Write an enzyme that holds these catalytic residues in place. Structure first.
Site, short mmCIF file in Angstrom:
data_model
loop_
_atom_site.label_atom_id
_atom_site.label_comp_id
_atom_site.label_asym_id
_atom_site.label_seq_id
_atom_site.Cartn_x
_atom_site.Cartn_y
_atom_site.Cartn_z
N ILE A 1 0.66 -1.26 0.10
CA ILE A 1 0.01 0.12 -0.13
C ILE A 1 0.66 1.15 -0.06
O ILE A 1 0.34 2.64 0.18
CB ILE A 1 -1.28 0.05 1.18
CG1 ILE A 1 -0.38 -0.18 2.66
CG2 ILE A 1 -1.98 -1.23 1.05
CD1 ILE A 1 -1.05 0.11 3.87
N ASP B 1 1.27 8.11 9.50
CA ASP B 1 2.36 7.87 10.34
C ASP B 1 3.33 8.95 9.95
O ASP B 1 3.71 9.52 8.84
CB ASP B 1 3.00 6.46 9.85
CG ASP B 1 4.10 6.26 10.93
OD1 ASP B 1 4.11 5.90 11.88
OD2 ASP B 1 5.31 6.08 10.29
N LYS C 1 4.72 -1.61 8.33
CA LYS C 1 5.98 -0.91 8.03
C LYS C 1 7.18 -1.90 7.82
O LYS C 1 7.37 -2.50 9.15
CB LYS C 1 6.34 0.36 9.18
CG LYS C 1 5.29 1.34 8.73
CD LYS C 1 6.19 2.88 9.02
CE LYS C 1 6.62 2.97 10.38
NZ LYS C 1 7.49 4.28 10.33
N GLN D 1 10.90 5.14 3.50
CA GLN D 1 12.22 5.50 3.68
C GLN D 1 12.94 4.01 3.84
O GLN D 1 14.10 3.82 3.26
CB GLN D 1 12.49 6.31 4.63
CG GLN D 1 11.73 7.83 4.32
CD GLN D 1 10.67 8.23 4.87
OE1 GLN D 1 9.55 7.35 4.93
NE2 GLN D 1 10.34 9.06 5.55
N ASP E 1 4.82 18.88 8.50
CA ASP E 1 4.67 18.46 7.03
C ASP E 1 3.11 18.16 7.08
O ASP E 1 2.82 16.80 6.88
CB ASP E 1 5.24 17.14 6.81
CG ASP E 1 5.43 16.94 5.40
OD1 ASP E 1 4.79 17.66 4.78
OD2 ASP E 1 6.29 15.89 4.76
N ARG F 1 -1.50 14.84 1.52
CA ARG F 1 -0.30 13.74 0.97
C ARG F 1 -0.28 12.66 2.33
O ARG F 1 -0.34 11.56 2.14
CB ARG F 1 0.65 14.38 0.79
CG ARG F 1 1.89 13.61 0.34
CD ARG F 1 3.17 14.76 -0.12
NE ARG F 1 3.71 15.29 0.90
CZ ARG F 1 3.94 16.73 0.95
NH1 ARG F 1 3.41 17.30 -0.26
NH2 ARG F 1 4.35 17.23 1.89
N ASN F 2 -0.30 13.48 3.50
CA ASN F 2 -0.20 12.56 4.67
C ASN F 2 -1.54 12.50 5.72
O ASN F 2 -1.36 12.42 6.76
CB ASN F 2 0.96 13.25 5.64
CG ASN F 2 2.07 13.56 5.04
OD1 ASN F 2 2.89 12.60 4.44
ND2 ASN F 2 2.81 14.60 5.01
N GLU G 1 5.45 2.86 -0.28
CA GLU G 1 6.75 2.65 0.04
C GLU G 1 7.42 3.86 1.01
O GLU G 1 7.23 4.96 0.84
CB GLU G 1 7.31 2.94 -1.64
CG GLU G 1 9.21 3.09 -1.54
CD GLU G 1 9.73 1.91 -0.95
OE1 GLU G 1 9.38 0.69 -1.09
OE2 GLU G 1 10.93 2.25 -0.38
C1 LIG Z 1 0.84 8.34 2.81
N1 LIG Z 1 1.52 7.60 3.95
C2 LIG Z 1 2.28 6.66 3.37
N2 LIG Z 1 3.58 6.98 3.14
C3 LIG Z 1 4.45 6.06 2.66
C4 LIG Z 1 3.97 4.48 2.64
C5 LIG Z 1 2.68 4.39 3.38
C6 LIG Z 1 1.76 5.09 3.40
C7 LIG Z 1 0.34 4.90 3.94
N3 LIG Z 1 0.14 4.38 5.35
C8 LIG Z 1 -0.96 3.87 5.71
N4 LIG Z 1 -1.88 3.62 5.03
C9 LIG Z 1 -3.06 3.04 5.48
N5 LIG Z 1 -3.99 2.89 4.34
C10 LIG Z 1 -3.82 2.93 3.12
C11 LIG Z 1 -3.18 3.43 2.29
C12 LIG Z 1 -3.02 3.59 0.78
C13 LIG Z 1 -3.73 2.62 0.59
C14 LIG Z 1 -4.27 1.67 1.03
C15 LIG Z 1 -4.69 1.88 2.54
N6 LIG Z 1 -3.31 2.81 6.76
C16 LIG Z 1 -2.35 3.34 7.54
C17 LIG Z 1 -1.22 3.52 7.36
C18 LIG Z 1 -0.20 4.18 8.27
F1 LIG Z 1 -0.67 4.04 9.67
F2 LIG Z 1 1.01 3.24 8.33
F3 LIG Z 1 0.41 5.35 8.33
S1 LIG Z 1 1.53 8.44 5.31
C19 LIG Z 1 2.58 9.57 5.20
O1 LIG Z 1 0.24 8.72 5.57
O2 LIG Z 1 1.83 7.27 6.16
#
Ligand SMILES: CN(c1ncccc1/C=N/c1nc(Nc2ccccc2)ncc1C(F)(F)F)S(C)(=O)=O
Length: 261
Positions: A15, A151, A41, A19, A133, A137-138, A17
Site C-alpha cells: 500500500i 504515520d 512498515k 524510507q 509536514d 498527502r499525509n 513505499e
Molecule cells: C501516505 N503515507 C504513506 N507513505 C508511505 C508509505 C505508506 C503510507 C500509507 N500508510 C498507511 N496506509 C493506510 N492505508 C492505506 C493507504 C494507501 C492505500 C491503502 C490503504 N493506513 C495506515 C497507514 C499508516 F498507519 F501506516 F500510516 S502516510 C505519510 O500517510 O503514512
C-alpha cells in the site's frame, strides 16, 4: 506490551513505499480479540543496528500519542526482519479519495475533514509538538466520515516549499505558527478535491510571489467565511496567525452553519 509475534500477522498487498522499506496491508490475529486490519512498515536493511535504531524510534514517536484522528501504533516485531504494525485506514489516501469522489462528496463532508484535522493538530499543540509536514498527502481515510493524520515517520519531511510558511523557507524556522500556515494549504487542497497548490509554478518562484502578497485563490463553492479563515492562516507575521484552538472552534461554527444550510 508493544511486542507482536510474527505468526499472528498475515501479510497482504503493498500500500506504499517508505524510507526503510515497503508498507503492506494485513491482518493481526489479536490474542483474545477479533482479527484487525493493519498496516505493516517493513525494513529492508535493518540487519545493521544503526538502521534498526532509527526505524524503531518512529514507532516510539507514535506510541506517545492517543487521539481519534491520528493513526495508532499496534506494536512491533523486533526479530529480523523488523516490522512496525499500525492501524489500517481502509479507504486509503485522502487526495485519491477526494479526486475519485470529486462529484459524490458534499461540502459538509469536506468541512468535517478539515475540522477533524484541527482537533488532531490542537492535541499535538497541547503536547508542544511541531508536525513539520501538514499536507493532504499525509492524511488517510478510515471511513466516509473519518480522516486521520498518517504515520509521522512515513511523512517525507519531518522540501515541501508550496506548503511552507515564509519563515520555514527563509530561515528553516519550524513552530506551531508555521504548522498553522501548512494546515491552511491542507484545507485549500481538501476544498479543491485533491488538487495540488501552485501547479505550473517553480519552487523558487513561490517565495517571490508570497512575499509580494500573492495567496492561493478561493476554491469554487468554498464558503466565504472558510476562505477568510484560510487567509488568516497565511498571515506573513506568524504572531498574526490563529492558534489551533481558535481554528477548531471556528471550523465547528462553519460546519454547523453548512449542516443547517
Ligand atoms: C501516505 N503515507 C504513506 N507513505 C508511505 C508509505 C505508506 C503510507 C500509507 N500508510 C498507511 N496506509 C493506510 N492505508 C492505506 C493507504 C494507501 C492505500 C491503502 C490503504 N493506513 C495506515 C497507514 C499508516 F498507519 F501506516 F500510516 S502516510 C505519510 O500517510 O503514512
Amino acid at each position: 506490551d508493544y511486542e507482536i509475534q510474527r505468526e499472528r500477522i498475515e501479510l497482504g498487498r503493498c500500500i506504499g513505499e517508505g524510507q526503510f522499506g515497503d508498507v503492506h496491508q494485513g491482518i493481526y490475529m489479536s490474542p483474545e480479540n477479533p482479527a484487525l486490519a493493519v498496516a505493516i512498515k517493513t525494513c529492508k536493511n535493518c540487519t545493521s543496528d544503526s538502521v534498526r535504531e532509527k526505524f524503531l524510534q518512529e514507532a516510539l514517536t507514535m506510541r506517545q500519542f492517543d487521539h481519534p484522528h491520528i493513526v495508532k501504533l499496534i506494536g512491533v516485531i523486533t526479530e529480523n526482519p523488523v516490522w512496525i504494525i499500525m492501524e489500517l485506514c481502509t479507504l486509503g489516501e485522502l487526495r485519491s479519495f477526494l479526486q475519485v469522489r470529486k462529484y459524490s462528496l458534499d461540502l459538509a463532508s469536506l468541512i468535517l475533514y478539515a475540522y477533524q484535522l484541527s482537533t488532531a493538530l490542537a492535541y499535538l499543540e497541547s503536547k508542544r509538538f511541531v508536525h513539520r509536514d501538514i499536507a493532504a498527502r499525509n492524511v488517510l481515510v478510515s471511513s466516509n466520515d473519518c480522516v486521520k493524520l498518517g504515520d509521522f515517520g512515513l511523512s517525507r519531511y519531518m522540501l515541501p516549499i508550496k506548503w511552507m510558511a515564509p519563515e520555514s523557507i527563509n530561515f528553516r524556522r519550524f513552530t506551531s505558527a508555521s504548522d498553522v500556515w501548512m494546515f491552511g494549504v491542507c484545507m485549500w487542497e481538501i476544498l479543491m478535491h485533491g488538487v495540488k497548490p501552485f501547479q505550473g509554478v517553480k519552487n523558487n518562484d513561490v517565495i517571490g510571489r508570497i512575499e509580494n502578497g500573492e495567496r492561493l485563490p478561493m476554491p469554487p463553492n468554498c464558503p466565504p467565511t472558510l476562505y477568510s479563515l484560510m487567509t488568516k492562516c497565511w498571515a506573513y507575521d506568524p504572531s498574526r496567525r490563529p492558534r489551533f484552538t481558535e481554528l477548531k472552534a471556528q471550523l465547528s461554527t462553519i460546519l454547523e452553519e453548512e449542516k443547517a444550510q
